[PDB]
């Protein structure tokens, strides 16, 4: 305990020796209060005017306009039963071994870390890299870990954050998981890391082709808050596949920063509290993704074991049941992993049959309680892969006029237009705002070409922003100045392993839409008076934005669509 977190607490107290206090009215029951000190300080979502001027009909849709305006953390999950714990340990050992069969754990390097900083995700961290003083501090902490101690690895609430140095040490020990694609479908069988939103539909359709029952897509309630110390210890077992320095460095990150967290949090009552918890997820956005994918893969194999009647009770695992679990994993584990599509806390499972639906004892006792359903009510499965929710999307099967088959991503169009109308942070020039608009427009042309309103608005934004201006922000092929019909052909035809005939598409009229009623169901404004006026007069809205940016080189993309041809 304090033997691992002490120094960090001691260091902070010293830097604030003239404002320390052990407030006895602290609002913490599940987090351990250590003290506070004087603090004073706070980012609200701003509107992208380029996108908003070119999406006027949506100015009166509350679902869109309300997106731009604007408890579970202090909870405790019970220690699972012993049979649950044995199931998890056995499954986690086997999964780490399967993931490392065709992969080599290895350290990430300052050079890799630096290049990422010089390319985005001392003031800015891009300045600390050059200052060797920073790296001197890193080595200090680094040699501090090698002894099994930490002093500078404390999270700052507000998506917790850490000093760049601590981020590097986590990257040096665990970066290999994302950088070498451990949760790729090829290597994990259930994973989709790096697979792309033009690939998720095809994946779900392949899972659908397997013999079995319904497709289940149960979202967990506050997954980040339900990670047990048992899960963190099962995650740590990746170190068993490591060697030398790496093995000790990874062990330290798991022991000192994950399985023993120290966090600073603001409290208006403004006294910065210093709480400590050994449970829940408190790592990187990228390591969190991969460890979430891993623990979700483990939970879903165990839920599959329970449906298939591999174990009878979680209270205790018999020696015979252990051999049965191990034999099940060795005999059908890879096939069972291929039945799932997991992305961090998000999953779709096509189990052997619908006994899975009522198999809830292990899932509930692991703490992975389902959202918006009664703890013991059986799961509502899906009978059609095109209505399954995954990664905030559903997928449409769409037949091209030449009979070739596209599987396309889709979501409620209010959500897509609402997100494009928002810019994160401040100090945006007109040009930087125009180029963020252009990133949305190019994404829409690539992924959402099949929605009539988004193809039209994407053409309008690309016509309203200078042709040579560069778009600025798994697979983001819209982040380019290349012609969008050429990127469409590469993504949907040339590089698409589900498409046998590689004949390029010659124009945008050969690229199909959803049904008109399909379009409206998914939130299109086709058939509204406001939308017809918007379309008819689109060249006037384009001209308004062009007049604001000024006399630059612009290209007219509206003649790509049939109606705008003279
Ligand atoms: C381009 C276009 C313009 C106007 C109406 C349209 O379709 C109407 C409106 C919704 N719906 C199911 C229809 O049949 C349309 F597609
Ligand atoms: Cl139709
Ligand atoms: Zn440390
Ligand atoms: Zn849809």
The structure's method of determination equals X-ray
Phi–psi pair at 387, nearest 5 degrees: -115, 0
Phi–psi pair at 471, nearest 5 degrees: -60, 140
- What CA–CA distance (Å, rounded) separates 504 from 485? 10
Q: Is 517 in the pocket of ligand 1 (CB under 6 A)?
A: yes
Tell me how far the alpha carbon of residue 173 lies from the centroid of ligand 3, in angstroms. Answer: 12
- What CA–CA distance (Å, rounded) separates 118 from 120? 6
Tell me how far the alpha carbon of residue 138 lies from the centroid of ligand 3, in angstroms. Answer: 9
Q: Is 237 in the pocket of ligand 1 (CB under 6 A)?
A: no
Look-up of token digits 């983001």: 476
Buried b / exposed e across 416-442, counting CB within 10 Å, b at 16+?
A: bbbbbbbbeeeebeebebbbbbbbbbb
519-527 long-range Cβ contacts below 8 angstroms, 24+ apart: 519/451, 519/452, 519/453, 522/410, 522/411, 522/412, 522/413, 522/451, 523/412, 523/413, 523/414, 524/413, 524/451, 524/452, 524/453, 525/57, 525/58, 525/453, 526/452, 526/453
| Intra-chain end-to-end CA distance of the chain, in Å | 75
Look-up of token digits 């929605």: 451
- Of 469, 462, 431, nearest to 444 by C-alpha is 462
Closest residue by CA, ligand 1 atom 15: 526
Residues 451 and 513: beta-carbon distance below 8 Å: yes
145 is known to lie in a ligand binding site: yes
In the beta sheet, which residues pair with residue 399?
A: 405
> How many other C-beta atoms lie within 10 A of the C-beta of residue 134?
17
- What CA–CA distance (Å, rounded) separates 189 from 226? 25
H-only helix segments in 16-109: 49-53, 62-65, 82-99
Closest residue by CA, ligand 1 atom 13: 516
β-pairing verdict for 261-265 and 155-156: parallel
Q: Is 520 in the pocket of ligand 1 (CB under 6 A)?
A: yes
Task: Give the list of residues 6+ apart from residue 191 with CB closer than 8 angstroms, or none.
Answer: 182, 183, 184, 185, 293, 297, 342, 343
Look-up of token digits 């058939």: 527
The number of the ligand nearest the C-alpha atom of 172 reads 3
Q: Is 148 in the pocket of ligand 1 (CB under 6 A)?
A: no
Tell me how far the alpha carbon of residue 558 lies from the centroid of ligand 1, in angstroms. Answer: 19
The number of the ligand nearest the C-alpha atom of 144 reads 3
Tell me how far the alpha carbon of residue 380 lies from the centroid of ligand 4, in angstroms. Answer: 20
Segment (H or E) for 347: strand 346-349
Tell me how far the alpha carbon of residue 61 lies from the centroid of ligand 4, in angstroms. Answer: 19
- Of 296, 92, 334, 294, nearest to 182 by C-alpha is 294
Q: Is 498 exposed, middle or buried (CB count within 10 Å of its CB: 0-12, 13-18, 19+)?
A: middle
Q: How far is CA 304 from CA 159, 240, 345, in A?
A: 32, 26, 17
- Of 343, 1, 360, nearest to 204 by C-alpha is 343
- Of 506, 417, 517, nearest to 458 by C-alpha is 417
- What CA–CA distance (Å, rounded) separates 391 from 485? 26
Q: Is 561 in the pocket of ligand 1 (CB under 6 A)?
A: no
- What CA–CA distance (Å, rounded) separates 393 from 416? 11
Q: Is 107 in the pocket of ligand 1 (CB under 6 A)?
A: no
In degrees, rounded to 5, the angle at the alpha carbon of residue 34 between the alpha carbons of residues 33 and 36 is 95
Maximum Cα interatomic distance, the chain, rounded to a whole number of Å = 78
- What CA–CA distance (Å, rounded) separates 415 from 276? 37
396 is known to lie in a ligand binding site: yes
User: By three-state DSSP, how is residue 323 classified?
Assistant: helix
Helices and strands of the chain, counted as H and E runs = 23, 9
Q: Is 526 in the pocket of ligand 1 (CB under 6 A)?
A: yes
How many angstroms is the resolution?
2.0
Q: Is 332 exposed, middle or buried (CB count within 10 Å of its CB: 0-12, 13-18, 19+)?
A: middle
User: By three-state DSSP, how is residue 181 classified?
Assistant: coil
Residues 278 and 261: beta-carbon distance below 8 Å: yes
150 is known to lie in a ligand binding site: yes
Tell me how far the alpha carbon of residue 518 lies from the centroid of ligand 1, in angstroms. Answer: 11
> How many other C-beta atoms lie within 10 A of the C-beta of residue 139?
10
Q: Structure tokens of 7?
A: 């120094």
Residues 382 and 392: beta-carbon distance below 8 Å: no
Q: Is 527 in the pocket of ligand 1 (CB under 6 A)?
A: yes
Tell me the best of 57, 451, 516 to mutate to test the pocket of ligand 1, counting ligand atoms within 8 Å of each CB and taking the most. 516
Tell me the best of 457, 527, 538 to mutate to test the pocket of ligand 1, counting ligand atoms within 8 Å of each CB and taking the most. 527
Q: How far is CA 365 from the centre of its chain?
A: 25
Segment (H or E) for 410: strand 405-410
- Of 227, 363, 361, nearest to 301 by C-alpha is 363
Residues 458 and 427: beta-carbon distance below 8 Å: no
Residues 192 and 333: beta-carbon distance below 8 Å: no
In degrees, rounded to 5, the angle at the alpha carbon of residue 119 between the alpha carbons of residues 115 and 120 is 115
Torsion of Cα atoms, 341 then 345 then 350 then 354, to 10°: 180
């Amino acid at each position: 305990n304090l033997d691992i977190i002490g120094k960090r607490i001691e260091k902070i107290k010293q830097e604030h020796e003239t404002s320390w206090h052990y407030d006895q009215d602290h609002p913490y029951k599940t987090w351990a209060y250590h003290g506070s000190y004087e603090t004073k300080q706070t980012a609200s979502s701003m509107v992208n005017g380029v996108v908003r001027l070119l999406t006027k009909p949506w100015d009166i849709i509350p679902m869109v306009t309300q997106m731009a305006m604007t408890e579970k953390v202090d909870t405790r999950t019970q220690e699972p039963k012993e049979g649950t714990k044995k199931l998890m340990k056995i499954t986690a050992e086997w999964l780490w071994k399967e993931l490392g069969k065709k992969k080599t754990p290895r350290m990430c390097t300052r050079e890799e870390f630096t290049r990422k900083v010089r390319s985005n995700a001392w003031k800015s961290a891009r300045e600390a890299v050059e200052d060797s003083g920073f790296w001197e501090l890193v080595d200090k902490e680094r040699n501090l870990h090698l002894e099994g101690k930490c002093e500078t690895c404390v999270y700052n609430m507000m998506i917790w954050y850490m000093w760049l140095g601590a981020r590097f040490l986590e990257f040096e020990a665990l970066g290999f998981l994302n950088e070498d694609h451990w949760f790729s479908r090829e290597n994990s069988l259930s994973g989709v890391e790096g697979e792309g939103l033009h690939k998720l539909g095809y994946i779900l359709r392949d899972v659908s082709k397997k013999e079995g029952g319904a497709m289940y897509a149960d979202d967990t309630a506050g997954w980040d808050t339900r990670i047990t110390l048992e899960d963190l210890k099962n995650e740590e077992m990746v170190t068993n596949h490591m060697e030398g320095e790496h093995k000790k460095l990874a062990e330290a990150i798991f022991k000192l920063t994950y399985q023993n967290k120290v966090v600073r949090v603001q409290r208006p009552t403004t006294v910065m509290d210093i709480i400590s918890r050994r449970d829940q997820r408190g790592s990187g956005q990228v390591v969190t993704y991969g460890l979430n994918t891993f623990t979700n893969m483990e939970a879903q194999l165990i839920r599959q074991m329970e449906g298939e009647g591999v174990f009878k009770s979680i209270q205790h695992l018999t020696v015979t049941e252990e051999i049965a679990v191990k034999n099940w994993l060795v005999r059908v584990g890879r096939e069972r992993l291929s039945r799932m599509a997991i992305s961090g806390d998000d999953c779709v499972v096509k189990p052997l049959d619908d006994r899975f639906a009522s198999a809830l004892t292990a899932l509930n006792d692991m703490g992975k309680v389902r959202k918006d359903i009664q703890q013991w009510e059986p799961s509502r499965g899906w009978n059609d892969w095109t209505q399954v929710p995954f990664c905030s999307h559903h997928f449409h099967e769409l037949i091209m006029k030449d009979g070739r088959v596209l599987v396309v991503p889709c979501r409620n169009q209010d959500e897509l237009i609402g997100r494009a109308r928002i810019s994160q942070g401040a100090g945006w020039s007109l040009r930087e705002t125009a180029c963020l608009g252009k990133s949305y427009a190019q994404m829409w042309s690539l992924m959402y070409f099949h929605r009539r309103d988004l193809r039209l608005a994407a053409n309008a934004i690309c016509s309203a922003v200078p042709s040579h201006w560069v778009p600025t922000s798994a697979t983001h092929e819209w982040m380019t100045t290349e012609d969008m019909l050429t990127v469409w052909n590469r993504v949907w035809i040339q590089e698409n392993p589900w498409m046998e005939d590689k004949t390029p598409v010659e124009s945008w009229e050969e690229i199909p839409y959803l049904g008109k009623r399909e379009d409206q169901w998914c939130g299109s404004l086709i058939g509204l008076t406001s939308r017809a006026t918007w379309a008819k007069n689109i060249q006037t809205a384009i001209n308004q934005v062009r007049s604001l940016i000024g006399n630059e080189e612009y290209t007219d993309y509206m003649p790509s669509m049939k109606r705008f041809r003279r």
